[PDB]
């Protein structure tokens, strides 16, 4: 009927808009997603490392006093391996694998160098915090349902794909 | 007419494709935000309990130098109750009423000993970070518009179940 | 066709609270955003001034052990300008142009006065961490495609209007 | 012969006031002997004492530094007896056959109770100088031709008396 | 009887070398003493300047630790007048009644200023060895039968004087 | 005369016997003399090498607060030869002339090596005192009327022989 007719034209005009509405909208809810993730992805490796740095902070100043240390994380905020033996003393440091000393060395961020191995337990002893008068004269003897980061990132990035292409 | 119902008939074909990408699109959405919430809210108190030991730091280098100590937050990020009397010294923590220790012990992370009373006292020291030559020979005396967190967390559940049970 | 033309009715009944369905849901995302923008824009800020206040701690410690002293960073994270003179001792405080001292003062969170220079350089070397016996004896001699944060704020809040009005 | 007689008369009046000159001489150079003997043996007390104390003050720098300590002499400037195991750590203090803490605590001038046994350890590891923050916050266990000085000093007392008996 | 004369001449002879011989020798014998009693004055002056300052060593390791201080002697060994008030702190130096002040400064040796009083109380907080952190930062508000030594020098003075008169 | 014979007589009884007497007296007031001439030089020596350990601790604490050192006498309690470069830092040690060294080492107590010269720096450095967590870290480069003491005991010496060949 006529004005049957022109009652759906009209419905036409409304539906077709309000889906390009809710098109656009989407799109730019994804980029703030995808944008949001990195943001926090910065601050969680901003305040791992933050954490090593504060243990070492507490083992220097417990070495003024004179008292034993514990433990330190890596980079990235995960327990040293539970094969590794302790790090208490200088005299710890002294007796290690020399491959034991570069799961350590890489562990914790310090560059050192791969064919020189004179100064490696020195490198260590500063990045455990072993320093104190004591510790600075010693004399080391030589080596004998829940998703994660990146899943839920790339399911943006397919995500914003599989809307783009059907538009 | 018959041209004209063919055209509403591919039209059928288009629009309800279109509403179901839509669909898809925002039940991936919901997951992305569900889970950006709980690694956000890990944060959050990762930070916190990490205040609480930046705070305490500082007061054992201040005893390391001789000199006073300042307010140390508790797990989670709140000032210490504004009823507790303050603590800057060790003699501050000897005449506490008992019944002020457990608040502190509690607010700080430590784990006592709810019948055996005799070192509370220490504890506490630790914790606030008064551990220097004289505070560990000091012979303490016996007693005589605006969302929320989980609300949002809650409203992203809700919000889920609501879109599920339409479809 | 009668059949058809209550096919076409029933299918408006559908179709328009189907709309209206993900019209709600949009809503609820589009909050549930603009709170969690907030709420991380909060961490931000605090990790920034611990970063500061952890960088001060380390100063702290190497002045006890009797070592130099390293950089420290603003409040917001950001490295002290390269025209800046560095400082490493109480005498590279000492000779400071009384124009690259308000700026240091500035960037650390120091509340001085604007009026009474008489101490400014004791205000700094607290704030950079040079409290030791030696530093406090010291005399000072007189003065001679990537979004950004707010922009996606922003956006959010454009995209709710733009939503709401067409609703 | 007259002048004969009278030569030898006046040589009485000289010989004799010459020997009673050399009476009185020999009288005061004595008492100044006597007197300066004690005035001297004085301070080989006080500087046994004063060496003592400054081996102790030795000990609480090293041990400010974390470093371990060496031999105390005793009151009276004589090694500790050969018998004795040395102390170097407090964990050297705390095994102590509860006999040689007696050795000790009388070497060193300090003065204990016989019968209350219970704080002899913390006695000792002050009067060695073992105070540092990790030594006061330990928790000792319970207990399982040449003369000499004074002979000359009477060599003086007995040659006095047998001079003036003869006068 | 002339052998009898002759005797007598003989023992003439004997006995007058006799007594020279021992007045020469107890000549010698006062020249050592007045030798020795000064090698001996110059110890004792010696020994009480060392001890002052080993006691001001003493309280300076003792601030180190963080514990309060004790007396110290003047030069000349003798105990601090009991009028004046005792010093266990910086508190304690900085309410003196600017009449003790001085008889503190001079007891000690420091040498200060008559008309400038400006630092004295400077002076004599590192006279007594109160040199820390907490202690450099103060901020001091304005002022609102025997014999003795000399004795028995000054007898073998007028000894050999004596015994030189009458040869 | 017969009675005159006799008073003459009994005057030789009593005058040899009493010179008998004073000789004896004078015998043992020398070797009194002579004792307690060793008994006070060696105080002289204790108190000297005494004197030099302390001014070591006086610069052993001041490096623990971070501050330069000061002078340290010799053995024998005479002031560093004036041609000698001072020494405030461990950059001054460094920059010795190897000949300058050995007069520092032989100047203290310390017994060298005197063919193997790799470390005579450190020797000097804790022998002066310069032992802090700074100074052990640091890393040497390579080398490019009046009698006097001994005058008065041999004066007793000849003194004595004098006296005894004579009788």
């Not at 839920?152 to 397919?158: G, H, L, N, T, Y």
């Given at each position: 009927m006529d004005e049957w007719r022109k009652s759906t034209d009209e419905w036409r005009k409304?539906?077709?808009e309000r889906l390009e509405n809710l098109l656009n909208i989407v799109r730019e809810?994804?980029?703030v997603q995808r944008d949001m993730?990195?943001?926090?992805?910065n601050l969680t490796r901003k305040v791992d490392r933050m954490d090593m740095r504060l243990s070492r902070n507490n083992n220097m100043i417990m070495r003024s006093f004179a008292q034993p240390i514990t433990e330190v994380p890596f980079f990235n905020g995960d327990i040293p391996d539970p094969n590794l033996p302790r790090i208490t003393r200088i005299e710890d440091i002294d007796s290690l694998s020399e491959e034991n000393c570069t799961?350590?060395?890489?562990?914790?961020?310090?560059?050192?160098?791969?064919?020189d191995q004179s100064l490696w337990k020195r490198q260590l002893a500063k990045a455990v915090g072993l320093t104190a008068a004591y510790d600075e004269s010693y004399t080391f003897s030589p080596f004998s349902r829940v998703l994660s980061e990146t899943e839920?990132?790339?399911?943006?990035?397919?995500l914003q794909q599989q809307?783009?292409?059907?538009?």
């Open positions: 409304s539906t077709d809810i994804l980029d993730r990195n943001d926090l992805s799961r350590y060395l890489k562990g914790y961020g310090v560059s050192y160098d791969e064919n839920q990132a790339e399911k943006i990035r397919r809307l783009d292409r059907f538009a």
